[PDB]
Write a protein that binds this ligand. Sequence first.
Ligand SMILES: O=C(Nc1nccs1)[C@@H](c1ncn2c1CCC2)N1Cc2c(cc(C#Cc3ccc(CN4CCC(CO)CC4)cc3)cc2C(F)(F)F)C1=O
Length: 269
Amino acid sequence: QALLRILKETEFKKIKVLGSGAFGTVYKGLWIPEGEKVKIPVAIKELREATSPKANKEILDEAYVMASVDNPHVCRLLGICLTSTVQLITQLMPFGCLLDYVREHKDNIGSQYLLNWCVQIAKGMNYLEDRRLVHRDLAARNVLVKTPQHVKITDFGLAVPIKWMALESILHRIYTHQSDVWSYGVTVWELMTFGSKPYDGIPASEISSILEKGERLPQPPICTIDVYMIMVKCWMIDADSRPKFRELIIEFSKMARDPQRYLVIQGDE
Ligand SMILES: O=C(Nc1nccs1)[C@@H](c1ncn2c1CCC2)N1Cc2c(cc(C#Cc3ccc(CN4CCC(CO)CC4)cc3)cc2C(F)(F)F)C1=O
């Protein structure tokens, strides 16, 4: 019945580890919902630290919000298991994170895929804005691949990635939908460089000073200047001058109609 299912351990199992971050470990698994027969492929995130009943109330309040997300380009929380180390269940995104996907499939990715991913990520971020949800950690690592044609945003349920942060976030810990636009621009740069490292080899402590001098990430080799200009707009110092997600959907959708006019990839005729 319930929007957020409160799971028993007997209902699911871990099959394969997928990755670990600072706060938890993600597994591919299987869930048979209590009272049902069907086997659902899931991702299971187990938190690194054990939590108290008090801490679990803060988790539950956020988990209900995460279960309320309903958009084709945003991952929804399906369930929670209140084990000592809490476990969080979503539908499995079988192709993993988009960062790894573009690094591992670089030779078989054309302009149409890249521009459609930019549209879809903008659509998911626009829904979050409509829901008054600030992501605060948008990056290619936090976009998942359902199919090569269908990506979804995740890991916004977490409220230091200095190299993805808007200048105002670095200087004053101000986070808004418009600082998410800055991070969107970095995410697009990641895609267009097939998962390269932003501000590579430069210490995080230097980034605010580089940005204050007007320096920005470089134009990727595949990008026409028209695409680079969208990234540049996302990195304007005045937050309210940056594009809105709705505007980014329009502009990337136009480019996706003639994708080889906007990204130049060898073999992508
Ligand atoms: O579930 C998540 N990812 C998954 N991937 C695959 C399967 S599930 C992602 C996620 N974010 C948005 N979405 C998702 C999935 C669907 C959309 N989330 C939601 C998520 C996560 C984490 C926590 C946590 C935590 C936590 C809290 C307190 C302490 C103790 N320490 C607090 C700090 C304090 C220090 O002062 C001391 C006490 C510890 C941990 C909660 C949630 C949420 F929202 F469910 F309540 C997390 O990662």
